[PDB]
Amino acid sequence: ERPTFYRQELNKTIWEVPERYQNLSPVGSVCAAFDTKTGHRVAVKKLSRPFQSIIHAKRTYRELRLLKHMKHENVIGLLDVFTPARSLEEFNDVYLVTHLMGADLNNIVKKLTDDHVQFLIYQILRGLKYIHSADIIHRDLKPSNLAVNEDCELKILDFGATRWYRAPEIMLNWMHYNQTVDIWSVGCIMAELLTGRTLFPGTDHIDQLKLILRLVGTPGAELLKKISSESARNYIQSLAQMPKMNFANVFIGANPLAVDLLEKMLVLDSDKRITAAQALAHAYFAQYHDPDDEPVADPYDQSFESRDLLIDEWKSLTYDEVISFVPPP
Numbered sequence: 192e193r194p195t196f197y198r199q200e201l202n203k204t205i206w207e208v209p210e211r212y213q214n215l216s217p218v219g220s221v222c223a224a225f226d227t228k229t230g231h232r233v234a235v236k237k238l239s240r241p242f243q244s245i246i247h248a249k250r251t252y253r254e255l256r257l258l259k260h261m262k263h264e265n266v267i268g269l270l271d272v273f274t275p276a277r278s279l280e281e282f283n284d285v286y287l288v289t290h291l292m293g294a295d296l297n298n299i300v301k302k303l304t305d306d307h308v309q310f311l312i313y314q315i316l317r318g319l320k321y322i323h324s325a326d327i328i329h330r331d332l333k334p335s336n337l338a339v340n341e342d343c344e345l346k347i348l349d350f351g352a353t354r355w356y357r358a359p360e361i362m363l364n365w366m367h368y369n370q371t372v373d374i375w376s377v378g379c380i381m382a383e384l385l386t387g388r389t390l391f392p393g394t395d396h397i398d399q400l401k402l403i404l405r406l407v408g409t410p411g412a413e414l415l416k417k418i419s420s421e422s423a424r425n426y427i428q429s430l431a432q433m434p435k436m437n438f439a440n441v442f443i444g445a446n447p448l449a450v451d452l453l454e455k456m457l458v459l460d461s462d463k464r465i466t467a468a469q470a471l472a473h474a475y476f477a478q479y480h481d482p483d484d485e486p487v488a489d490p491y492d493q494s495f496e497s498r499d500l501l502i503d504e505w506k507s508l509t510y511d512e513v514i515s516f517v518p519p520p
């Protein structure tokens with residue numbers, strides 16, 4: 192049967208939630224709460240006008256579909272989703288419930304042993320193997336999107352500078368992108384954990400690209416062969432004029448296996464960049480890698496992503512997913 196809701200106002204926002212969630216306190220529109228059913232603290236996010244427009248309705252549908260799919264130790268999961276509405280005609284608000292994250296990767300680092308770096312990057316790559324197997328690309332991996340508890344256990348999420356961790360093919364608007372845009376980001380994150388400083392702290396995207404190119408070098412012939420336009424080929428050479436740095440110097444003091452792995456992640460040609468599944472088998476993770484416990488995802492139906500639908504259609508699809516939700520064990 193339908194739970195009893197109670198109404199509350201917080202930070203000028205109306206909150207209507209099942210009575211099981213008590214002691215809401217604001218932390219978007221997100222409250223920490225106490226889940227009386229289980230005894231643990233949770234986070235409750237109220238989406239902001241989810242069906243005000245076509246783009247909002249589709250983004251609401253997308254986030255719910257993605258959250259309902261994620262069943263992996265290193266990826267955020269959905270504990271609950273609800274609406275106060277009793278029917279589709281009344282359906283206007285959507286609430287998502289997740290675990291409460293006490294700290295992100297930045298909070299944790301405010302210096303890690305090489306063992307901590309191994310374990311943190313291992314977990315990111317394990318979560319990425321999972322989401323990438325479902326043809327899901329994060330596209331905005333960065334320390335503030337990584338929840339880490341005091342036990343160094345890590346989950347990937349997207350709260351929604353990105354620039355510093357972004358793959359060069361995106362900032363250059365090159366033709367083909369693949370899932371290894373996320374691997375570039377992992378390389379940038381791992382570098383920072385090892386050195387304590389941002390690897391490519393660009394002031395703008397052009398500055399960013401210049402710093403990238405002086406470390407990883409101007410494109411080689413194999414990469415240049417795949418770039419269609421003369422002006423793009425000339426431009427990337429315009430940006431590769433700073434005196435060249437070398438990995439060995441930049442990462443002095445790091446585990447040599449870590450530097451080898453970084454050289455395989457920070458590759459300009461995304462056809463040659465190491466994948467998440469390949470990276471898990473790198474010697475740097477020898478103490479953690481287990482091929483029997485690095486699972487892939489169930490098939491994920493992305494057919495909706497290409498659709499141009501009306502607001503009421505996206506809303507009805509979202510309502511369907513709210514109603515069909517099954518809590519995890």
Ligand SMILES: Cn1ncc(C(=O)NCc2ccc(C(=O)N[C@@H](CCC3CCCCC3)C(=O)N[C@@H]3CCCN(S(C)(=O)=O)C3)cc2)c1N
Pocket residue numbers: 218221234235236250251253254257258261266267287288289290291292293322327328329347348349350351
């Ligand atoms: C202190 N603390 N502790 C917990 C919380 C909290 O807030 N808990 C609620 C919450 C948190 C994160 C998410 C989340 O990660 N939403 C992912 C799910 C998909 C991704 C796919 C790649 C792997 C990670 C999960 C996603 O789709 N995020 C998009 C990012 C930008 C685009 N939007 S949009 C669809 O346009 O609106 C959203 C959702 C709800 C908090 N503050």
